[PDB]
């Protein structure tokens, strides 16, 4: 039955990614006085299927200068980790219940970076190398702030167990307790997924296509799916951490729905930001994350360490 | 005089650092100037992580509570009203 | 599945051979990645969830900065792989052969003494039968760093600050 | 072993997608198509040439910052101790030292590039 | 060395408490108060003998009193208790806060039919005195004889006979 | 380098050595070694030159390898004993690994190769610290574990160190390399008596530290790094070269100078333990060190070399920098032989 | 030169982690607390030279607890003999060792 | 000892041999250093967990901290060599002889 | 609000710990009886398995001390089935 659970957590996520592509296109269109995909299927509902079939029926090209092994391993690592980072998510019950699921998520994200690195390096192109170096610089800028903010907001949780987040927020969303950390975490998640004002690894208007410039057909589809799956997963993480939802143990559907709606709202805000701001310069991205967030993240880490002790509100260990 | 000019200039050019030093400064000073830090300590001691191993009764332990729930011994009534 | 730890340790040795033969540092990077992940797996299997995840996380972040430099300093017009130079391939094959020989000698011959005395039984044997209760003993011992290990905290913090200073002094010309 | 099963399933699914991608479509390859992309013109030099990092110091310090983040992770469990005074002082000491290192790097123009 | 003495299969046979963890947790608070005396004696034995084979008899008395504890529940509070532990059994954490309504029903019947009072907060964790008659073990660790210490110092100091006797140095 | 930053780095080196010499936990000893290396590398590279960078890289590589071997030995000792205290190590393999690591840190041959190169690469100011202060921590660790040290390995390392130091010193015209090889020979002399009597090792360390402080401070006061450059010092300042000749004679181990004390006491202790061939060989091999010291004394003071015309301008000016400890270090390194019975205070 | 400043000033910088028999958080005992306690109390004050030979039984027990080399050797011998017996059909594992009887709670 | 201990010790030995045997780049030597550090971490962690030395569970973290400190030292020395010579080749470190 | 909720959660955790403490003596009794029974079964089967082997004393202690030493996993489940060994060893670690 566990294999059935694995399939019921992977296939629906891939379908959600496929339709999130269409949702993003239509949202951008309607925010640009346009109409998203509207011909292929009713209201464009068949566009993702057409895109997938085109990509997987498209000839994939293997660059002559490319290192084949890494060039093929990178896409696999990207998708596998994108699908794996959903394993510990509590909705309301996690598939795999870890005492340290949060650190597992951090480690899985840190590994996913190497997909962009190796894809860029192995592509053996100047634009791909620039994209890989930009990914390196991006992960240099956000990782420390990401971990510090996550630690500070989990100091009121009592452990790194993700399921406990539901209990901690049983009377109040944790965003009412750490909204500056919430803002900084949201921006860090934007930077991490190579997303709005931080689309520097891909850089459509500056690097043609970034690290995936030499990728076509299937592998390109896998990188896109991994990117959007990471988007949805990170938005789900933001939902569980700050926007807690009521969980009736006898009717888990209530939580599931509330959770899904919050994640959808966060993804829609991701697209909203994508169609509202110009792109950063990765020098400015690193300067922001190192000189405006990091000092403030350290200060708020001090504050959230001292607060439970000074208010006698240390959360339970178990 | 000079402090007011410095702080006004600091919050006009680099407002991010002004907040961080203020928040960081409070996190060091406030815990000492609090009456609930001792309560936080007592709560941690109160939680019985390990078994309360009993001691052999020699007959000369007046305050040690040889009982299920008789009055002698420590009380958590303070935590109940916290 | 009773020898998961042994398989992971063999993969650990394989990755160590992989980045010890000195291919292009890019490839040494993934060698160290595999070794660190498999070591995290071993530590998880022995009950060290936090410690294993900690090595996994730190080395994952550290090898990234190494990769950045491999493309900036150790960048050869033709980066070499384990099957690109007879020296690198020879080192890789020699390491694999050494590992395989020692594994075979340890397995088929229960008691093996190369330098120390190794027993061929499974690693499950040495495990203890005690109950930790409502504890993560590794987590509590690690968290005792801020209560018991104040001196360790002081020295480590001073070393990290002095490390920042030393990096800035070195990379100034 | 369940986590191993999940990892195996994900890896197998990804590799199967790769296999279908590389064996379903009709393949017609020639030298010009597989040539590196340089916006329509032939590249001058190799992409494996050195690429200078203008933020090398930032990365070397990010190493130590990741170290400090590793040191700070046990904090949620450290708050469960009875020596809250010493624990709090040591945690604030580590955070103060991290802030001091950041400040030293900032003032000595280490966070700047080039 | 020697042969590890092991108790026979017969002498470690007890009527097991064949209930579930959820059942035990539901009655745990009342079980600690009512079966305090025999459980504390066994804990003192195990923590003074430091040998499981020297406290089997006390361990048997724990099960006998535990069974007697549940026998009274079955005879006076059968149905309300069954409602209580079924609610607790549902939750994966076996929480107490999701079944307070059923808990009040079980406490009310038990307070009337049996007279038991649930212990308050911080009462089952207190260190108690146990009045036993088994002698306190003289050598629980079975330690050998401590080796004789080296001779300890002497009286007052006097100058070296002829100073430092280093070659030609007379002082 | 900012003077405040330089003072902090020097204090960090000293604090690392004090952590090694003060702790009772192996982990803290390794931590002190790591701090010493971390704060020593920039001190090696205070004056930025390609040679300085090369010296720093070689020193860092060698000390890193030694620290890795030391930590492996510590981990194996913990595995076979469950102990972290600095005591009788309970595993022979761990003892051997730790001995190799500590010899590599000290520069005992055949781990001597880095010393002449790192010493030559760095300036005299850094060379003095490298050849004097950096020997304290490994020697202290060896003195704490002298009981568990395999005497054969330590004696072989000491004898090889003396032989190689003497042989290397003969072909050297750079003063820093001569000092490095002399340091290797003296480290061999110190480690020869470690299994027998550690107080003699401490006495030899103190005498060597005084002699090397005097020599390096005289070189700094003369701003000389080669035999030819030092030869000119007879014209501007004959006192400095005369004191240098006296200190070289002391380093040779010639009585009644202080350099005879350590060799004499070491031979005494080694003969008390029925070892007569090893001290005799060590005494005979010290003649090579005495040879190159004498050659330097000839080129510097005993004989006068051709100067240059521009020294006339230098004659008018007086040295501004004043090393307050130089006269005391010269006196203690030349005229302390009548004070050997003070050995007991080191007990 | 072990400058024992800790014993002089009374400070405790690292003596709290030197042994596993020392005080540990929440009184979590070491796996070989008893053996190490016996070895330390036996060899306290008599000097290292005497401790090596006199309190050698205690140290051997401590090492056996730490590494279980001899216990593993005995278990391996038992396993090998059982396998040899099964190959020749001279032995039949009992049902409680064959997963046929319910293990006691 | 268990076979996992043998494997980890062998991994440390292989990494040490690799570090002692340079080929061209200084980056690979730092890789071997980090590998040795990782092997020592795994060894110490297994030893501490197996013996339930609770208070010593913080030792591997300190080892890791000083490990990446040494790694940062190595990286800074690497950049200086590259700045001074153009390549990180270990053969450029040749001015200092004997 | 988080202060109030965290204080309530600490009280709940204390209550759960008290329940665990109340249940602990019975679990300790069952554990020691089960361990002793498994040791006895292993000794009984060993007496048959290695009766032919020369000089093999059955149940011989490996320690010099005549003190109770908690058996290792291989000393309890050494000859049990592989499924039982895997359970008793890696069950808690692998359960998620």
Automatic annotation (TrEMBL), chain B:
Belongs to the complex I NDUFA3 subunit family. Complex I is composed of 45 different subunits. The chain holds residues 88 to 169 of 169 of the full protein. It comes from Sus scrofa. Accessory subunit of the mitochondrial membrane respiratory chain NADH dehydrogenase (Complex I), that is believed not to be involved in catalysis. Complex I functions in the transfer of electrons from NADH to the respiratory chain. The immediate electron acceptor for the enzyme is believed to be ubiquinone. Residues 54-82 are annotated as: Disordered. It comes from the Eukaryota. Coiled coil: none annotated. This is NADH dehydrogenase [ubiquinone] 1 alpha subcomplex subunit 3. It is found in: Mitochondrion inner membrane.
TrEMBL record, chain E:
The keyword Repeat applies. Keywords: Disulfide bond, Electron transport, Mitochondrion, Repeat, Respiratory chain, Transport. Residues 145-159 have a biased composition (Basic and acidic residues). It is found in: Mitochondrion intermembrane space. One of its GO terms (cellular component) is mitochondrial intermembrane space. It comes from the Eukaryota. Residues 77-110 form the CHCH domain. The keyword Mitochondrion applies. GO terms for biological process: mitochondrial electron transport, NADH to ubiquinone. Residues 132-163 are annotated as: Disordered. Disulfide bonds join 35-65, 45-55, 77-109, 87-99. Belongs to the complex I NDUFA8 subunit family. Accessory subunit of the mitochondrial membrane respiratory chain NADH dehydrogenase (Complex I), that is believed not to be involved in catalysis. Complex I functions in the transfer of electrons from NADH to the respiratory chain. The immediate electron acceptor for the enzyme is believed to be ubiquinone. Complex I is composed of 45 different subunits. This is NADH dehydrogenase [ubiquinone] 1 alpha subcomplex subunit 8.
From TrEMBL, chain G:
It is found in: Mitochondrion inner membrane; Mitochondrion intermembrane space. The keyword Methyltransferase does not apply. Its main location: mitochondrion. Disulfide bonds join 32-65, 42-55. GO terms for cellular component: mitochondrial inner membrane; mitochondrial intermembrane space; respiratory chain complex I. GO terms for biological process: mitochondrial respiratory chain complex I assembly. It holds the Pfam family Ndufs5. It comes from the Eukaryota. The keyword Translocase does not apply. Residues 84-105 are annotated as: Disordered. Keywords: Disulfide bond, Electron transport, Membrane, Mitochondrion, Mitochondrion inner membrane, Respiratory chain, Transport. CDD domains: NDUFS5-like. It is a peripheral membrane protein. Mammalian complex I is composed of 45 different subunits. This is a component of the iron-sulfur (IP) fragment of the enzyme. Belongs to the complex I NDUFS5 subunit family. Accessory subunit of the mitochondrial membrane respiratory chain NADH dehydrogenase (Complex I), that is believed not to be involved in catalysis. Complex I functions in the transfer of electrons from NADH to the respiratory chain. The immediate electron acceptor for the enzyme is believed to be ubiquinone. This is NADH dehydrogenase [ubiquinone] iron-sulfur protein 5. It comes from Sus scrofa.
TrEMBL record, chain I:
One of its GO terms (cellular component) is respiratory chain complex I. Its main location: mitochondrion. Complex I is composed of 45 different subunits. Interacts with CARD15, but not with CARD4. Interacts with STAT3, but not with STAT1, STAT2 and STAT5A. Interacts with OLFM4. The keyword Mitochondrion applies. This is NADH dehydrogenase [ubiquinone] 1 alpha subcomplex subunit 13. Belongs to the complex I NDUFA13 subunit family. The chain holds residues 49 to 144 of 144 of the full protein. It is found in: Mitochondrion inner membrane. It comes from Sus scrofa (Pig). It is a single-pass membrane protein. Accessory subunit of the mitochondrial membrane respiratory chain NADH dehydrogenase (Complex I), that is believed not to be involved in catalysis. Complex I functions in the transfer of electrons from NADH to the respiratory chain. The immediate electron acceptor for the enzyme is believed to be ubiquinone. Involved in the interferon/all-trans-retinoic acid (IFN/RA) induced cell death. This apoptotic activity is inhibited by interaction with viral IRF1. Prevents the transactivation of STAT3 target genes. Keywords: Electron transport, Membrane, Mitochondrion, Mitochondrion inner membrane, Respiratory chain, Transmembrane, Transmembrane helix, Transport.
